[PDB]
């Protein structure tokens, strides 16, 4: 189990990540790049190290969001890979890969890469 | 110096990479995604480890191509990062990052990621 992961996280763009960390190492929740906007809400699932080293190392984790809900389908999926770092300034530092479904000829532009930092405090 | 890097390399898409490895660790040459087509030819510069380990490890290297020549300007640049592996089946395995100039709002789609494998034999 990883105590301080469960809860609401905000990236620097305004997006909200709401997650529950299961004792089993399961991450379950929703991602919304808007303010309680249902059309901007998507389901996420992931995994985290439920028994991290005690030496001050961070807690490795990862999650995926397929960009399809009841209002839209962007034919793409993003995976965030990173680690949770506890403390008064808790944060989840990540790197992401956004892949779009493409034809074979267009596969060269299928994957974008970037990074996000989530904190527990509003934007 | 790294003996077998200088020469003509081909990726699996048909692109041609012509490079000269300087004794100083300098990589200089041209990249053309076409057949001797001048409008498809771009200048490249990079660096490589000129005194690699002898234990069978590969030779680390990297190069950049800004996509602007006398016929076109795609307002973007690609960096390839990888290593040279000698032998009868010489090859340069790489991972690349293609960044396009964007406005601040469009920065999320600025960088694409992919990979290429170059061999000395035609496609």
């Amino acid at each position: 189990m990883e105590a301080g992961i469960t809860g609401t996280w905000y990236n620097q763009l305004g997006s909200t990540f709401i997650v529950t960390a299961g004792a089993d190492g399961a991450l379950t929740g929703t991602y919304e790049s808007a303010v309680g906007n249902a059309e901007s809400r998507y389901v996420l699932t992931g995994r985290y190290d439920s028994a991290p080293a005690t030496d001050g190392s961070g807690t490795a984790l990862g999650w995926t969001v397929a960009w399809k809900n009841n209002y839209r389908n962007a034919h793409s999926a993003t995976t965030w890979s990173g680690q949770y770092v506890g403390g008064a300034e808790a944060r989840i530092n990540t790197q992401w890969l956004l892949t779009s479904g493409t034809t074979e000829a267009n596969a060269w532009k299928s994957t974008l890469v970037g990074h996000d930092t989530f904190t527990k405090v509003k934007p | 110096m790294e003996a077998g890097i200088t020469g003509t390399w081909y990726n699996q898409l048909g692109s041609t990479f012509i490079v000269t490895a300087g004794a100083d660790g300098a990589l200089t040459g041209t990249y053309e995604s076409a057949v001797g087509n001048a409008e498809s030819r771009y200048v490249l510069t990079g660096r490589y480890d000129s005194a690699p380990a002898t234990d069978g490890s590969g030779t680390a290297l990297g190069w950049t191509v800004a996509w602007k020549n006398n016929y076109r300007n795609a307002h973007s640049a690609t960096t390839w990062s990888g290593q040279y592996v000698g032998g009868a089946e010489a090859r340069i395995n790489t991972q690349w990052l293609l960044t396009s100039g964007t406005t601040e709002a469009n920065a999320w789609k600025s960088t694409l990621v992919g990979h290429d494998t170059f061999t000395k034999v035609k496609p």
Binding site: S33, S40, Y42, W67, L98 | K109
Partner: peptide, 9 residues
């Protein structure tokens, strides 16, 4: 081009 939903699109 169009705002992807990940970025408030």
């Amino acid at each position: 081009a169009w705002r992807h939903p990940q970025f408030g699109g």
